[PDB]
Amino acid sequence: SEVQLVESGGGLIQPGGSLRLSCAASGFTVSSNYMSWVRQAPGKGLEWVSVIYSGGSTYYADSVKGRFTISRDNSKNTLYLQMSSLRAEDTAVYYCARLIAAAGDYWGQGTMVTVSSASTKGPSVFPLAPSSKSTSGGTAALGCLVKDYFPEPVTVSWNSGALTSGVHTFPAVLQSSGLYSLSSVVTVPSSSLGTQTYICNVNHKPSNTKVDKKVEPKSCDKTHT
Amino acid sequence: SEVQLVESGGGLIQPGGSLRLSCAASGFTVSSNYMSWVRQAPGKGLEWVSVIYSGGSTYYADSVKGRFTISRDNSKNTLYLQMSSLRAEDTAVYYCARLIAAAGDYWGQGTMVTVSSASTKGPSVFPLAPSSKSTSGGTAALGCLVKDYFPEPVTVSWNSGALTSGVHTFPAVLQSSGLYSLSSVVTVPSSSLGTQTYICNVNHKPSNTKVDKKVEPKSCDKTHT
Amino acid sequence: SDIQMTQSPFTLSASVGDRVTITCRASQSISSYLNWYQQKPGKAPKLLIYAASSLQSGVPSRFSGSESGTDFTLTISSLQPEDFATYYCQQSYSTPWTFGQGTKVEIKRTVAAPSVFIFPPSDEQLKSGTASVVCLLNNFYPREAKVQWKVDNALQSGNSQESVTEQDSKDSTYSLSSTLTLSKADYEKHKVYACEVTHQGLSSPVTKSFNRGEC
Amino acid sequence: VQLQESGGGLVQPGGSLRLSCAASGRTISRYAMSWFRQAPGKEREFVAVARRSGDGAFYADSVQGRFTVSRDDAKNTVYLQMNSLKPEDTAVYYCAIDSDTFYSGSYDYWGQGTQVTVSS
Amino acid sequence: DVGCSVDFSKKETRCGTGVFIYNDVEAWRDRYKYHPDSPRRLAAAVKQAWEEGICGISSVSRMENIMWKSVEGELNAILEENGVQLTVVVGSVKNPMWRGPQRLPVPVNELPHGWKAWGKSYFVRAAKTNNSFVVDGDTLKECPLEHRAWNSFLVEDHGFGVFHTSVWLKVREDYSLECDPAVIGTAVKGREAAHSDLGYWIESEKNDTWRLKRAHLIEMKTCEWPKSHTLWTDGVEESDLIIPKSLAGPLSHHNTREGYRTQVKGPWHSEELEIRFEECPGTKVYVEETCGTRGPSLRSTTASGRVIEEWCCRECTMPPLSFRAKDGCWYGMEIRPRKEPESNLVRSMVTA
Amino acid sequence: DVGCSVDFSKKETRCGTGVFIYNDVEAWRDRYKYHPDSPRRLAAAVKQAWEEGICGISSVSRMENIMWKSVEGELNAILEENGVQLTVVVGSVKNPMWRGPQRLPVPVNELPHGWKAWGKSYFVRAAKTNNSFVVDGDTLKECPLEHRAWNSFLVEDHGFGVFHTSVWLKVREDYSLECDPAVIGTAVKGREAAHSDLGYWIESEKNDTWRLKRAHLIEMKTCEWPKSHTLWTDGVEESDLIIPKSLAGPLSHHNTREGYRTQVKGPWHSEELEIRFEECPGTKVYVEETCGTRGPSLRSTTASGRVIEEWCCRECTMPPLSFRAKDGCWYGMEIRPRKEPESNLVRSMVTA
Ligand SMILES: *[C@@H]1O[C@H](CO)[C@@H](O)[C@H](O)[C@H]1NC(C)=O
Secondary structure, three states, rough: OOOEEEEEEOOOOOOOOEEEEEEEOOOOOOOOOOEEEEOOOOOOEEEEEEEOOOOOOOOEEEOOOOOOOEEEOOOOOOOEEEEEOOOOHEEEEEEEEOOOOOOOEEEEEOOOEEEEOOOOOOOOOEEOOOOOOOOOOOOOOOOEEEEEOOEEEEEEEEEOOOOOOOOOOOOOOOOOOOEEEEEEOOOHHHHHHOOOOOEEEEEEEOOOEEEEEEEOOOOOOOOOO | OEEEEEEEEOOOOOOOEEEEEEEEOOOOOOOOEEEEEEEEEOOEEEEEEEEOOOOOOOEEEEOOOOOOOEEEOOOOEEEEEEEEOHHHHEEEEEEEOOOOOOOOOOOOOOOOEEOOOOOOOOOOEEEEOOOHHHHHHHHOOOOOEEEEOOOOOEEEEEEEOOOOOOOEEEEEEEEOOOOEEEEOOOOOHHHHHHOOOOEEEEEEEHOOOEEEEEOOOOOOOOOOO | OOOOEHHHHHEEEEEEOOEEEEEEEEEEOOOOEEEEEEEEOOOOOEEEEEEOOOOOOOOOOOEOOOOOOOEEEEEEEEOOHHHHOEEEEOOOOOOOOOOOOOOOEEEEEEEEEEEEEEEEEHHHHHHEEEEEEEEEEEEEOOOOOOEEEEEEEEEOOOOOOOEEEEOOOOOOHHHHEEEEEEHHHHHOOOOOOOEEEEEEOOOOOOOOOOOOOOO | EEEEEEOOOOOOOOOOEEEEEEEEEOHHHHHHHEEEEOOOOOEEEEEEOOOOOOEEEEEOOOOOOOOOEEEOOOOOEEEEEEEEEEEOOOEEEEEEEEEOOOOOEEEEEEEEOOEEEEEE | OOOOEEEEOOOOOOOOOOEEEEEEEHHHHHEEEOOOOOOOHHHHHHHHHOOOOEEEEEEHHHHHHHHHHHHHOHHHHHHEEEEEEEEOOOOOOOOOOOOOOOOOOOOOOOOOOOOOOOOOHHHOOOOOOOOOOEEEEOOOOOHHHHHHOOOOEOOOOOOOOOOOOOEEEOOOOOOOOOOOOOEEEEEEOOOOEEEEEEOEEEEEEEEOEEEEEEEEEEEOOOOEEEEEEOOOOOOOOOOOOOOOOOOOOOOOOOOOOOOOOOOOOOOOOOOOOEOOOOOOOOOOOOOOOOOOOOOOOOOOOOOOOEEOHHHHOOOOOOOOOOEEOOOOOEEOOEEOOOOOOOOOOOEEOOOO | EEEEEEEOOOOOOOEEEEEOOOOOOOOOOOOOEEEEOHHHHHHHHHHHHHHHOOOOEOOOOOHHHHHHHHOOHHHHHHHHHOOOOOOOOOOOOOOOOOOOOOOOOOOOOOOOOOOOOOOOOOOOOOOOOOEEEEEEOOOOOOOOHHHOOOOHHHHHHHHOOOOOOOOOOEEOOOOOEOOOOOOOEEEOOOOEEEEOOOOEEEEEEEOOOOOOEEEEEEEOOOOOOOOOOOEEEOOOOOOOOOOOHHHOOOOOOOOOOOOOOOOOOOOOOOOOEEEEOOOOOOOOOOOOOOOOOOHHHOEEEEEOEEOOOOEEEEEOOOOEEEEEEEOEEEEEEEEEOOOOOOOOOOOOOOOO
C-alpha cells in the first residue's frame, strides 16, 4: 500500500483527565524508523514533545516531564502515546512526525485536544449606533455582532447570503470566561441607508440555535428623559 | 549534641517558578538513614512526597514524579530538595520526616510554602441590623463584618479588649478573589442597647492599617425616594 | 495503585474513663509493616505504636494494638483528658506508600436546634452591582446542617458556598454560614429570599425577623 | 406501605414499659429508624434515633439514660425499652423510617401513633 | 588475571585480564562453610536481643539455614558456661519465605566471664533450659511471625583459600532492606546478558529487542533487588515484569516479555522452580480471543494423573509461559483451561 | 562460556561456566583481516556515493581507517578493470573527532565482471589521478566537512579471533546514530565495576555511594553511547558527568564524581589520554573560596617547559582531577592558578 499516516482519538475532557492517541502507519514499518510527536499551540510555533529510537530508547521534553508515555506495536505496525494529568494550557493540535533528516518526512493530518472547565450555549446579537464623541468615518457603519457562544463551529451570513460585497468576518477570540466572540461588518454609501433591509444570520449547530436580527439605520429615540 | 531539626527555604513565589528546600540536622548522620518529605494540605491530612535510601536510591510518588529533585550534602550533614513547575494546588506545609518504620521518628518545626499571584490590602468594616421576616435571636444580634483583606493575619478586638464574655469570632475562609473574610459578635442582653458604646477594632499588621467602626442600635432611615 | 489504606469509622465520641477502639484495614496481606500516627491540632504529628505491636518509651502504657490476617486495631483502656486528638493509619511495605483518612476523638455532650438568621447586603455592597444573601446558623448539634434556596420555585444548584466553625471550648456546639452571590440585575428580579434548613433533630423550616424591601 | 405503633399503657411513677413498631412492603435492614413523641398540645419532638446494626444510636436529653432502642430486621420490628417513668412523659409516640442515607433528614411514611400516660 | 576461555560456539582460545562472572548456583552446597565473628559476641548479642521480646529469626535464603544448622547446638555449649537459661533450636526452610519486622542489635560489651573463641566445644549437647529460642521451621505455634528478625547479616568478605570459604558474617549496624550486594553480580556482552546471584540465574537475549530467554530458581526471596546493579533502569510498567517486584525481582527492561504481565499467583510453593519458554511435556498452548481472563495458575497434571490438553489466553505471545518444578509442570497466570472449570483442576497456591 | 580464572590477590581458582571480559585497549589493535563484505559488491557502493555528490568520508574510530589502509589498492583495481576514473587517498586522524551528516547507500546489483579482487594470485597495482575520494585527513579543500559520510558500517561476526581474525563488516541498511553494540561490554561485581569498549576503559569503585576511580582513553570517539548496555540510567544530571554525552560518555551514576561538573572544555587534542585523580609532580591544588571561575582547561607546564605550581578551586575534593598524556599534565576546568589569574599559559580552545 501507499505511505500515509493517520491520527484518531481527539476529543474533550475536563482538567485532570487522561486520554489515549494513536499514530497508525502504512507501507513502511514504524519499528525500523524514528518517530516523534509534535504539537502546535494555537497561533504559535511548533513544539517538540518526545522521540523514540528504533532501538527502544525515548526522551521527553520539559513541558511533558513525567506526564507522557509512548509505546509501539509490532504485530499491526502501530504507535501509541499516553497522557496523564492534563491541564487547560495543554490545548493544541497533535500529530506524529517522521523527523528523519536523510530522505524526507511524512506528517499526519492531526487532531485537536480540548480542555475546558465549563460548558453548549447559544449566541447573542445586538445592533449598533454611530454618533457623539468616540467613533467616526462618515460612511455607513451598520452591522451585526455576535458574543457569548460556545463551542465551535458557527457561521455568519447577510441576507441569507444574497449580499457578498464588502463582507467581513473577524476571527473568533476566546474571552477569559471561556466563551467565543466575533464580529461582522459591511459598508455601503450612506444614500442607500433607509432604502434597503439588512439581516444577519447567526448559526450555532452544537446547540441547534438559529438567531436572526434585523438591522436598520435606527435614529436616536426621543423617549422620556 | 542532641538531635535538632530545622527546615527553611519557604516563602511566597509566583506560579510557574522554582524553589529549593533544605533540612539541616545535628547529632545523627543523614547519610546512613532513610529520609522523606511529608506535606499537609490546608485542613487536610498528611501526604508522602518522596524517599531517599541511605544507599543513594530514590522513589517518587505519582503526584510529583518528574518535577522534584532531592540530594544530600554529606560533608556538613545537610539535606536539600528542589522543585520545578510550581502551581497553586501545591501550597502546603512540608516536613522532612524521619520515616523509619521500625525505630522511631524525629520531626522538625516545618516550613510554609505559598504559591499565588495576588498582591497587601486593607480590610473593610460594616455594621448590621435585622427586622421583619428573615432574621431573629431575641437579643442584641450585632457584629462587625471584616472582608476583602489579604494576607493574614488580622486581630479583632472590641472596646480595646476590655470585655471577653459573650465575644467570639468566626473562622476565616479564603474567597476565590484571593481575599479573606470573617465575622465577630458582641451579643449581650437587649437591656444594654442604647446605654453603652460598642466599638470593634480591626488591626492589619502587614500594612500597619487600623480601622474602627462604632455599632449602634440604628433603625431604618426614611430617606426620600 | 498497589496498596490502599482505609480507616473506619470517621469519628467517634466518648467521655473520661471510657474504652475506645479504632480499626484500620488493608486490601491484601502485607505482613505487619504498619504504624499509627497521632496528630494534635497546631502541632507536629507523632508516632506512638511502631511495628504494629510495640509502644515507644514515654506516656504510660495505656495503648494497645494487634493483627489478625488483614485487620488492625488500636484501643485505649481508659480515656484521659489529654487523649482527645487525631489518629492516622500508615503502611511502609511497597511503593507508593499511602496514609489513612484519619479519625478524631471529641468530648461527648448532649441535641440542640440551630438559630436561623440572614444578614443582608448593604448600600456599600449594593452600589457595586453585586449582592450576596447569606444564610447563618448557630448553636446546633449534631453535624447535619443542610441549606437550600427556593426563591419563587427557582431551585439553586451548587452555586452557593459554605463554611463551618469549631465546637468551641465551652458551648460545645456548631455554627454554619451559607453564602451565594448574584448581580444587582438578578438581585431584584425576585421578592422572597428564604434559605431552607433541614436538620435531623427538626422537622420543618422556621420564621424570623428581617427581609428585603420590607424593613 | 404503612406504619403502626403499639405498646401504650398506664403505670405509676417509676414504672417501665415496652413498645414496638413495624411496617410492610419494605425491608428495614437497609434503613435506620427514628422515634418521636408529641407532648400535650405540642408538636412532634425528638426522642431517639438508632442507626444500622453496629453503627450506633442517639437518645434525646429528656430520655437519655432512661430508655433504649433495638432493631429486629428479621421480623421487621423495632423495640424501645422504657423505664423509670414520671408523669411528665404523658404524650403520643410515633415511629418513623429513615431514607437511604442519614444525610437526608426526611421521611416517606409516618405511623398512626399510640398513647402513653402516667400518673401518681 | 588469565582464563581458559574456551568458546564452545566457535572453539576459540582467548586470553587477557579483566572481570569474571561465574555460575555458582548449581553447586551451592559444597562451596561454603560459614561462621560468625567471635561467637563469644554472637552469644551475648542473641541473649540481649531475647530480653527485648524478640522470639526467633526467619531465614532469608537457604545459605543462612545451612549456616544455622552447621552451628546448631554449639551455641548452647558456650552459653552454658555463663549460666544462660535459654535454648536455641533450628528448623527448616519452605517455599516461599516471608519478611521479619524486627532486627537484631549490636552489643556494647561482650560476656563478662568466658574467653572461648573456638575449639573443643564439639563434645557437648544439652537439654532444654527454662527458656526456649526458635529459628525457622514449622514452629508457627510457639511465637507469632511478627516477633522475629529478618535479613540482618552482612557479608564482610567472600572467598578464601579453603574451598569451604570462611565467609565472615555479622549483624548489620544500620537499618536497611535491600538484598546483600557483596555476592551479587551481572554482565552483558554482544547479544547476551544475565544477572547472577547465589540462588538466581536470569538470561536475556536480543532477538528483536531485549527480553527473557531462560532462568533458574532455587528459592524465593523477598528483599528489594538493588537498583545499582541493574541494566537499563529507565521507567517500565511494573505489570510487564515477569518476576514480581515483591519476589526480589530485577528492575530492568530485560526482565520482561511483550504480551505477558506480573505473575503473582505462580507455583511458588514448589521446592525447585525453573522458567523456560517451552510448553509443558505433551501439552500445547494457543492464543485465542474468547478465553478466560487472568487468574490463579493451573497445573498441567492432575493429582489423579490426568493431564490437560487445552489452554488459551488473549494477550499472550504464543506458545508457552511455562514453569518447571520437581512436582510437575505449571503454567502462567494469563493462561486458562479452554473447556474445563478450575474446580476440577489443581489450582496453584495463591500467595499474592 | 566455559573458562578458568585466578584472582588478582586472593588464591581462588576454578574452571567453571560463566561470562568473562578482558581489556582490549593496550593490545594496540590486533592484526585482524576485516572482510568488509565481498569486495566485489562493495565496489558498486562507492560508485553511487560519488555519483550522488559524496566526496569525502570522515572516520568514527581508529579501526575503519586501518581496514581502508589494509584493502587500499584493490579497490582502485576494480574500477580500473571496469573503467571508472576514481581512487582513494588516506590520511591520519587528529583529535577531537567530528561527526558527519551523510550515510552511504546500498547497491542492489553486483558489478558485471570476473571478480579478481579477493583471493587472486597477487599482482595488485594502480596509479594516481585527480579524482580523489579522500578519506580522513585535513584535505578539506577537495571535500568540505559537511559533505562527508560517517559511521555507515555494521558488524556481522566477531569470530575467528584465534588464527584467521576476520571480523565481518557490512554496510548498514538503515539510518541511526547509536554505536555498534556488537563489541560493547560492561559488567559489575561487588565493590568494583567498570565499563569498557575497544577504545575506552572506565573504572568505578564502591568506596562511598559510587564514584569515578580511574579511566583510560585512546581516541576521542563522539558516537552516541547506547542506553541498553549501561547501568543505572536514571537519576543523574548532565552537568555532573565527567565525559559529556557528546563524547560518548556512559550515562550512569557511576560515570560522575562529587564536587565536579562536566569537562566540555578539556584538553581533547592529545592522542591517548588517561584520567587520574592525583596531583601532578611538583604541582598541588588547594580547596579555597577566593578562586576564579570555570575557565577552559590549562596546561600544567608553561610554553617554556617549566611547570606551574599554585592552583585553586572551590568545589574540588582531594584528590584533584587531572588529565595525563604524552604531552604532559593538564588540570581540571574548575582548577585555576591561585595567586595570578594571568592567561600566560598554554590553553585549550573552546570545544562543544
Ligand atoms: C528473531 O526475531 C525474529 C523477528 O521477530 C523472528 O522472526 C525470529 O524467529 C527470531 N529468531 C531467530 C532465530 O531469528
